[PDB]
Write a protein that binds this DNA or RNA. Structure first.
Ligand SMILES: Nc1ncnc2c1ncn2[C@@H]1O[C@H](COP(=O)(O)OP(=O)(O)OP(=O)(O)O)[C@@H](O)[C@H]1O
Ligand SMILES: [Zn+2]
Lengths: 525, 229, 224, 142
DNA sequence: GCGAAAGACACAGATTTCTCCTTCGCATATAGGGATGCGAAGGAGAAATCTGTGTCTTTCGCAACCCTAAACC
């Protein structure tokens, strides 16, 4: 069943019937939801023309993982920026119809004298449903003007708005971006300075990760803990009755104040709305609730999965404030006493788990939603032991999200398949720097890091110090049968003096000398 | 003096100058026969640029009397020198640092194994953790070999005592197959299906596969010649 | 490189084109497929110059292209000549893509079809190239200039790293074979009897391998 | 220094920074406080009482040593610090620089991690901490 | 008369920066004591600039046209 045909069928069926409950139980709505649930959102292609330092480029994106490798002056970061622009438009239309997104500023156009405009082309695939978006901007004073094309994006966003309008537990895609400035964000220590209800539209405020989310993460954790305390308290319907009585008293006070203080009235209205939302949450609690204690243990266990050296995490109330307690070995520490690597790996996973939990209130296990995540400099503040295990944990904890990653280390590269590696090189074609993309020749999953450095990055895995020069000259002398020479003895004395006689390297050359000498003896006789 | 110091640190360039154009101004660097802008440099080059610039500025301002101000005395501490550096850059930073300023004392911490291969074994300390008398405390050790001029993985295995080869599931079949080839067993159906999996994941022409197949030919020729006479 | 054994001419569709047409771009896809079929048959699966693998054991395909030994602009009389065709890799820093942007005298180039390259070059264990001694001035000029134009003798990295890795990966077979030969000469046998057999076996085991000439040369020297 | 995460690689550098801070402060002016040890930096074990750092600086054949300490809470630390040696070096440098102009001074620098007068004549500052990835400020200075 | 796609117009509100307000500490010109006056840090609470939302504006190459000459709408 094609998604488009079901969408139009529901659209035409919607106009005739005016009763809402018939639509809410129609077979068309059920088919639309069923076909929308089992579809994987994923970008397909991307192209860039005259954007910043890039002249022309076309890139195809894998549906599971993609790694960009290479060094150059234009910088691999800019490609991620291009994708970030496109996704912003999709988010805006979901919030409200025909809301503007993010434009291309004039100073980002190429400064060459033979350019007039810059453009970005993207395509989004959803099973067999294809959409495309083009974003372009022309230089000042251009004879012809260019405009964006937003038919496909608005059409795709209309389906999400339509489904979310009738069912109150709809799921939405996830988009996020972690730049290299998160180290500063990960350095946040202490408050250095409480929403009653949390909705899925809260996260959609911004795309790029910044400092304020860490503060909000602490608040969310506190709320999650307090709700679980009620479950431990075994609160009965009397708590709901008391809340309803307090809501009625607040409504009576608001009515009295309405007669013979705009801020006070607004605060009273907000409090009444919060009480109504709490009452609706209590009503939803009878419908299997959500097991907030399970959510608390799910987030704690997911964080603990990346830190095997720690025992437990706890929230301790003291001095009229809440503090996080970390137990490592046989010691108790505060989050400000950790190293940089643990802070970064704590914040990244905490933010990802918070976003996924908030975005899918319906799913039994909310860590199986769809989305797209872009990460820059995956190997920040990590020792080689952790570098060889991050990928498996990332692609095993969240198995339905598409990752785009740039890296700089061969240890990370040796744990990914050769079909997900793209190498960027600069070619001075026709007296003009270009950008070409290539693939590794051989499979590099499971090989040593020397081979992954030689093939996946095209670099010599052996330095070129002066001692290596002495080694090469001596090896040439022995390999040329002319090892019996005064100069050879002079070089050999230096070699033994530096490396040492027990070194494994010297043994090989000595063996070569012995076999060659034998051959000479036999040939002479 | 600052410009000449930066030029001495990086000999791949020719000159650096500030140019006031008809409608703008920019800094121009010449390398080979190409003119480049200061803003076309990568993050690593900018980091090296500002590090050397600040070091030279301080050294010049601290020795106003010496004929060559780069011959002062002092101590410099660097933490995680390998931040935002391509592997080809990591293999030459130490020699330039220790050759531009030859009368200064350096204390450096690092994470990458590529940097280690260019450092002599006399000046490397390894921190471990052992428990003595029921109390866990840190200890300091030294490498057992000379790690100047060794390859990447030799330096990783010796200077850091970790595993250069990952523990992926795909490597398990390769290890099992090679072990089976040792105790002559390359006729069982289990070996045949493991060879099928290995040949499917890597390929016929993978160097590892060819090296594995080489042993079979060596044994076969061995018993052939042995039986011939 | 090695001495390429050119076979009887099989240009086929190349005969259809003539000088008046020129227009190398006008060649059809079927014509290119037929030419590649012949080139693969004659050349094996290795690059003409650097001997790097160009075709896998058939999604991504290794980049390859057709090269003319003589420049088209200066020697347009050989644009469609069969003897001027060659197959080259797509490496953007050596072989064909590097020959174009260089100034050289064509008359002083080594052609794999005419002369045997083994009389000039001699590879070593670590992957560098050594020019043989005793050659005339003209020969030394050709040997010294062909490496410079082809970028086949860099200071570090490039082709040398791959050649070294291939040799160190194939060193075990050489060590074992030379051990067997040494054992067989320590008991008693005819030198030419054992030598022919070991050489035949080694030659059989090194067919269709990357950089087969470097391992070839590294083999005789160790051999008694 | 080579090690894994959480193995005290940064602790050594911060220790040397505290050691050099007092020498620099005495160099600038006699009897000036340096930098102290934060309360949270003391060990969290039950039986700990105080923390101390000791150092030794060698100039040809001349030697000097310095020890700094702090107490957890109400315990009995090793009395007070020991700065007698550092004040002799500071006095020597002050005396040399007072009579003869354009003399020389030692250099002490520390390029830390993100975390977070001739110098005054042009633009520069006298601080021991400098941070990388600040290419804009160096560009404007140039 | 007015598709799609970017700006102008009107109305909130939010936030970092700064400028006025304690508080006691000092000081130095008059043989120690006391006093008129100024300097140092917190601690405000004010204000300019920026940002965000909702209603219009504009004017398409806009299924469905005739084929002889000139002028007008
Ligand atoms: N008050 C404390 N008591 C006990 N141990 C502490 C205390 N504060 C910190 N630690 C220990 O310090 C360790 C981290 O030390 P440190 O910052 O030197 O690590 P690092 O990995 O070398 O640092 P970096 O990444 O900054 O180079 C933690 O593992 C923790 O056990
Ligand atoms: Zn080639």
């Amino acid at each position: 069943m094609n998604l488009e045909t079901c969408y139009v069928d529901f659209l035409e069926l919607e106009s005739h019937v005016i009763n809402e409950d018939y639509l809410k139980e129609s077979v068309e709505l059920q088919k639309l939801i069923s076909t929308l649930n089992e579809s994987k959102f994923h970008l397909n292609k991307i192209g860039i023309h005259d954007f910043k330092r890039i002249r022309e480029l076309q890139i195809s994106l894998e549906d599971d993982l993609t790694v960009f490798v290479g060094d150059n002056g234009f910088g691999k970061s800019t490609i991620l920026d291009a994708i970030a622009i496109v996704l912003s438009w999709l988010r805006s239309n979901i919030e409200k119809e025909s809301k503007p997104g993010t434009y291309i500023k004039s100073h980002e156009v190429n400064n060459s004298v033979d350019v007039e405009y810059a453009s970005i082309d993207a395509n989004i695939k959803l099973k067999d449903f294809n959409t495309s978006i083009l974003i372009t901007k022309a230089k000042e004073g251009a004879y012809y003007s260019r405009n964006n094309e937003l038919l496909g994006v608005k059409k795709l966003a209309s389906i999400y708005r339509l489904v979310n309008k009738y069912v109150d537990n709809a799921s939405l895609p996830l988009m996020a971006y972690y730049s290299i400035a998160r180290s500063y964000i990960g350095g946040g220590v202490d408050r250095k300075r409480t929403k009653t209800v949390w909705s899925k539209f809260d996260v959609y405020d911004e795309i790029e990760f910044d400092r304020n989310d860490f503060t909000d993460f602490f608040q969310w954790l506190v709320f999650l803990h307090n709700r679980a305390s009620q479950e431990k308290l075994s609160e009965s319907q009397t708590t709901i009755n008391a809340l309803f009585s307090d809501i009625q008293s607040l409504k009576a006070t608001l009515t009295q104040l309405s007669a013979i203080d705009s801020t006070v009235i607004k605060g009273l209205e907000l409090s009444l709305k919060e009480k109504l939302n709490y009452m609706k949450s209590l009503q939803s609690g009878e419908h299997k609730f959500n097991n907030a204690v399970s959510l608390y243990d799910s987030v704690i266990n997911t964080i603990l999965k990346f830190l095997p050296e720690f025992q437990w995490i706890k929230l301790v109330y003291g001095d009229d404030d809440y503090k996080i307690i970390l137990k490592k070995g046989e010691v108790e520490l505060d989050i400000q006493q950790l190293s940089q690597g643990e802070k970064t790996i704590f914040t990244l996973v905490g933010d990802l788990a918070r976003r996924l939990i908030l975005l899918n209130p319906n799913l039994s296990n909310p860590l199986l939603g769809y989305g797209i995540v872009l990460i820059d400099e995956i190997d920040l503040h990590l020792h080689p032991q952790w570098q060889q295990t991050i990928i498996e944990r990332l692609t095993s904890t969240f198995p339905n999200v598409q990752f785009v990653i740039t890296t700089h280390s061969p240890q990370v590269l040796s744990t990914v398949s050769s079909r997900s590696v793209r190498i960027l090189q600069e070619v001075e074609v026709d007296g003009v720097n270009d950008l070409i993309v290539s693939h590794p020749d051989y499979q590099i999953k499971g090989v040593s890091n020397q081979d992954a450095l030689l093939y996946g990055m095209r670099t010599d895995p052996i330095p070129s110090t002066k001692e290596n020069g002495w080694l090469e000259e001596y090896k040439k002398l022995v390999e040329l049968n002319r090892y019996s020479s005064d100069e050879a003895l002079l070089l050999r004395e230096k070699v033994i003096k530096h490396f040492g006689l027990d070194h494994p390297l010297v043994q090989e050359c000595d063996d070569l000398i012995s076999v060659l000498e034998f051959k000479n003896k036999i040939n002479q006789h | 003096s600052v410009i000449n110091t930066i030029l001495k640190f990086l000999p791949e360039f020719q000159w650096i100058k500030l140019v006031y154009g008809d409608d703008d101004y920019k800094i121009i660097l010449k390398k080979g026969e190409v003119e480049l802008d200061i803003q076309q440099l990568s993050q690593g080059e900018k980091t090296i640029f500002t590090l050397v610039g600040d070091l030279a500025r301080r050294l010049i301002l601290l020795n106003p009397n010496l004929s060559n101000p780069l011959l002062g005395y002092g101590i410099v501490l660097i933490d995680e020198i390998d931040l935002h550096l391509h592997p080809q850059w990591q293999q030459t930073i130490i020699e330039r640092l220790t050759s531009t300023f030859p009368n200064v004392q350096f204390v450096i911490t690092t994470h990458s194994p590529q940097v280690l291969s260019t450092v002599s074994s006399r000046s490397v300390r390894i921190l471990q953790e052992v428990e003595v008398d029921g109390v866990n405390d840190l200890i300091v050790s030294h490498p057992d070999y000379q790690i100047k001029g060794v390859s990447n993985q030799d330096a990783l295995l010796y200077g850091m005592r970790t595993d250069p080869i990952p523990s992926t599931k795909e490597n398990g079949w390769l290890e099992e197959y090679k072990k089976l080839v040792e105790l002559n067993r390359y006729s069982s159906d289990e070996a045949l299906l493991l060879r099928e999996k290995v040949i499917k994941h890597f390929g016929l022409d993978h160097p590892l596969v060819q090296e594995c197949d080489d042993l079979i030919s060596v044994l076969e020729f061995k018993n052939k010649i042995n039986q011939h006479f | 490189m090695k001495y390429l054994s050119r076979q009887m001419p099989g240009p086929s569709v190349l005969n259809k084109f003539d000088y008046r047409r020129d227009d190398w771009n006008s060649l059809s896809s079927n014509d290119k497929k037929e030419i590649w079929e012949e080139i693969i048959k004659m050349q094996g699966k290795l690059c003409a110059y650097c001997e790097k693998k160009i075709e896998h054991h058939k999604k991504n395909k290794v980049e390859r292209h057709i090269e003319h030994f003589y420049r088209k602009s200066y020697y347009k009389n050989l644009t469609f000549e069969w003897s001027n065709l060659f197959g080259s890799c797509g490496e953007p820093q050596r072989c064909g893509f590097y020959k174009d942007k260089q100034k050289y005298n064509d008359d002083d180039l080594i052609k794999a079809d005419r002369q045997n390259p083994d009389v000039f070059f001699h590879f070593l264990e670590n992957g560098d190239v050594h020019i043989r001694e005793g050659l005339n001035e003209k020969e030394h000029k050709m040997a010294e200039v062909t490496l410079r134009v082809f970028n086949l003798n860099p200071s570090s990295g490039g082709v040398k790293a791959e050649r070294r890795r291939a040799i160190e990966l194939s060193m075990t077979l050489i060590k074992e074979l030379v051990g067997c030969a040494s054992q067989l000469i320590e008991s008693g046998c005819e030198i030419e009897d054992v030598r022919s057999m070991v050489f035949d076996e080694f030659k059989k085991n090194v067919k269709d391998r990357c950089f087969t000439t470097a391992i070839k040369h590294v083999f005789e020297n160790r051999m008694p």
